Design a protein around this motif. Structure first.
Motif, PDB file in Angstrom:
ATOM      1  N   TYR A   1       0.845  -1.196   0.000  1.00 27.39           N
ATOM      2  CA  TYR A   1       0.000   0.000   0.000  1.00 27.39           C
ATOM      3  C   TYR A   1       0.875   1.237   0.000  1.00 27.39           C
ATOM      4  O   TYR A   1       2.051   1.175   0.365  1.00 27.39           O
ATOM      5  CB  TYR A   1      -0.886   0.033   1.235  1.00 27.39           C
ATOM      6  CG  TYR A   1      -1.548  -1.291   1.381  1.00 27.39           C
ATOM      7  CD1 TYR A   1      -0.849  -2.331   1.989  1.00 27.39           C
ATOM      8  CD2 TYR A   1      -2.842  -1.489   0.902  1.00 27.39           C
ATOM      9  CE1 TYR A   1      -1.446  -3.576   2.123  1.00 27.39           C
ATOM     10  CE2 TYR A   1      -3.439  -2.738   1.034  1.00 27.39           C
ATOM     11  CZ  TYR A   1      -2.737  -3.777   1.646  1.00 27.39           C
ATOM     12  OH  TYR A   1      -3.313  -5.016   1.766  1.00 27.39           O
ATOM     13  N   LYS A   2       0.305   2.372  -0.396  1.00 31.37           N
ATOM     14  CA  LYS A   2       1.056   3.635  -0.428  1.00 31.37           C
ATOM     15  C   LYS A   2       0.228   4.731   0.232  1.00 31.37           C
ATOM     16  O   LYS A   2      -0.992   4.742   0.139  1.00 31.37           O
ATOM     17  CB  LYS A   2       1.369   3.997  -1.889  1.00 31.37           C
ATOM     18  CG  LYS A   2       2.254   5.249  -1.971  1.00 31.37           C
ATOM     19  CD  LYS A   2       2.583   5.529  -3.448  1.00 31.37           C
ATOM     20  CE  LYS A   2       3.475   6.763  -3.549  1.00 31.37           C
ATOM     21  NZ  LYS A   2       3.784   7.046  -4.981  1.00 31.37           N
ATOM     22  N   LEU A   3       0.904   5.645   0.920  1.00 30.84           N
ATOM     23  CA  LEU A   3       0.231   6.739   1.614  1.00 30.84           C
ATOM     24  C   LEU A   3       0.635   8.071   0.978  1.00 30.84           C
ATOM     25  O   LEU A   3       1.821   8.338   0.799  1.00 30.84           O
ATOM     26  CB  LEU A   3       0.664   6.732   3.093  1.00 30.84           C
ATOM     27  CG  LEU A   3      -0.368   7.412   4.037  1.00 30.84           C
ATOM     28  CD1 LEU A   3       0.337   7.817   5.341  1.00 30.84           C
ATOM     29  CD2 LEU A   3      -1.001   8.676   3.422  1.00 30.84           C
ATOM     30  N   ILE A   4      -0.347   8.921   0.694  1.00 27.91           N
ATOM     31  CA  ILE A   4      -0.072  10.259   0.136  1.00 27.91           C
ATOM     32  C   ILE A   4      -0.319  11.292   1.209  1.00 27.91           C
ATOM     33  O   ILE A   4      -1.366  11.304   1.847  1.00 27.91           O
ATOM     34  CB  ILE A   4      -0.972  10.570  -1.043  1.00 27.91           C
ATOM     35  CG1 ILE A   4      -0.810   9.488  -2.107  1.00 27.91           C
ATOM     36  CG2 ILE A   4      -0.619  11.944  -1.615  1.00 27.91           C
ATOM     37  CD1 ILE A   4       0.655   9.353  -2.544  1.00 27.91           C
ATOM     38  N   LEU A   5       0.669  12.132   1.443  1.00 24.67           N
ATOM     39  CA  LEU A   5       0.576  13.128   2.481  1.00 24.67           C
ATOM     40  C   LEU A   5       0.426  14.550   1.987  1.00 24.67           C
ATOM     41  O   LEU A   5       1.303  15.077   1.299  1.00 24.67           O
ATOM     42  CB  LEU A   5       1.859  13.025   3.287  1.00 24.67           C
ATOM     43  CG  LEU A   5       1.914  11.631   3.934  1.00 24.67           C
ATOM     44  CD1 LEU A   5       3.374  11.193   4.145  1.00 24.67           C
ATOM     45  CD2 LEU A   5       1.157  11.674   5.269  1.00 24.67           C
ATOM     46  N   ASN A   6      -0.650  15.199   2.425  1.00 23.67           N
ATOM     47  CA  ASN A   6      -0.889  16.600   2.119  1.00 23.67           C
ATOM     48  C   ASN A   6      -1.114  17.327   3.445  1.00 23.67           C
ATOM     49  O   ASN A   6      -2.175  17.906   3.682  1.00 23.67           O
ATOM     50  CB  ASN A   6      -2.129  16.763   1.231  1.00 23.67           C
ATOM     51  CG  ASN A   6      -2.201  15.653   0.197  1.00 23.67           C
ATOM     52  OD1 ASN A   6      -1.186  15.273  -0.387  1.00 23.67           O
ATOM     53  ND2 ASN A   6      -3.359  15.109  -0.069  1.00 23.67           N
ATOM     54  N   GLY A   7      -0.120  17.285   4.320  1.00 27.27           N
ATOM     55  CA  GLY A   7      -0.247  17.930   5.620  1.00 27.27           C
ATOM     56  C   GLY A   7       0.250  19.355   5.578  1.00 27.27           C
ATOM     57  O   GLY A   7       1.101  19.708   4.767  1.00 27.27           O
TER      58      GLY A   7
ATOM     59  N   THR B   1       1.892  20.669   7.881  1.00 28.94           N
ATOM     60  CA  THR B   1       3.228  20.597   8.477  1.00 28.94           C
ATOM     61  C   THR B   1       3.998  19.386   7.953  1.00 28.94           C
ATOM     62  O   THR B   1       5.226  19.346   8.031  1.00 28.94           O
ATOM     63  CB  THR B   1       3.105  20.503  10.005  1.00 28.94           C
ATOM     64  OG1 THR B   1       2.077  19.578  10.337  1.00 28.94           O
ATOM     65  CG2 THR B   1       2.763  21.879  10.586  1.00 28.94           C
ATOM     66  N   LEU B   2       3.275  18.381   7.445  1.00 33.14           N
ATOM     67  CA  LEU B   2       3.911  17.162   6.947  1.00 33.14           C
ATOM     68  C   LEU B   2       3.416  16.800   5.548  1.00 33.14           C
ATOM     69  O   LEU B   2       2.227  16.587   5.331  1.00 33.14           O
ATOM     70  CB  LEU B   2       3.614  16.032   7.929  1.00 33.14           C
ATOM     71  CG  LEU B   2       4.405  14.775   7.543  1.00 33.14           C
ATOM     72  CD1 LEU B   2       4.479  13.836   8.759  1.00 33.14           C
ATOM     73  CD2 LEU B   2       3.742  14.058   6.346  1.00 33.14           C
ATOM     74  N   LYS B   3       4.347  16.721   4.596  1.00 34.50           N
ATOM     75  CA  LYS B   3       4.010  16.375   3.211  1.00 34.50           C
ATOM     76  C   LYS B   3       4.981  15.358   2.638  1.00 34.50           C
ATOM     77  O   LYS B   3       6.137  15.275   3.050  1.00 34.50           O
ATOM     78  CB  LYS B   3       4.017  17.648   2.338  1.00 34.50           C
ATOM     79  CG  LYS B   3       2.624  18.317   2.347  1.00 34.50           C
ATOM     80  CD  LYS B   3       2.764  19.850   2.313  1.00 34.50           C
ATOM     81  CE  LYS B   3       3.453  20.368   3.604  1.00 34.50           C
ATOM     82  NZ  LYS B   3       3.466  19.303   4.653  1.00 34.50           N
ATOM     83  N   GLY B   4       4.494  14.606   1.657  1.00 40.56           N
ATOM     84  CA  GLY B   4       5.302  13.607   0.979  1.00 40.56           C
ATOM     85  C   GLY B   4       4.502  12.334   0.749  1.00 40.56           C
ATOM     86  O   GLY B   4       3.300  12.378   0.490  1.00 40.56           O
ATOM     87  N   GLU B   5       5.189  11.191   0.828  1.00 36.11           N
ATOM     88  CA  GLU B   5       4.556   9.896   0.616  1.00 36.11           C
ATOM     89  C   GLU B   5       5.211   8.837   1.496  1.00 36.11           C
ATOM     90  O   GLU B   5       6.347   9.000   1.941  1.00 36.11           O
ATOM     91  CB  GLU B   5       4.677   9.468  -0.857  1.00 36.11           C
ATOM     92  CG  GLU B   5       3.805  10.366  -1.768  1.00 36.11           C
ATOM     93  CD  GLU B   5       4.584  11.576  -2.269  1.00 36.11           C
ATOM     94  OE1 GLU B   5       5.704  11.766  -1.826  1.00 36.11           O
ATOM     95  OE2 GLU B   5       4.046  12.300  -3.091  1.00 36.11           O
TER      96      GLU B   5
END
Length: 56
Positions: free
Chosen positions: A3-9, A11-15
């Motif tokens: 599985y993969k996680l996409i981050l749009n935080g 303060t926190l971004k990336g994958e």
């Protein structure tokens, strides 16, 4: 299974990526990661792409 996680935080971004038995498992694992990483946003999941996303 992978599985993969996409981050749009704000303060926190990336994958991020983790292997799980199923989505039921990967979902709790990613949220923990986000939770241990202080991320609080909106969550969604795609079973056809095996990708989770969180956005604050």
């Amino acid at each position: 299974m992978q599985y993969k996680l996409i981050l749009n935080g704000k303060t926190l971004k990336g994958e991020t990526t983790t292997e799980a038995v199923d989505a039921a498992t990967a979902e709790k694992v990613f949220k923990q990661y986000a939770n241990d990483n202080g991320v609080d946003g909106e969550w969604t999941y795609d079973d056809a792409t095996k990708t989770f996303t969180v956005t604050e």
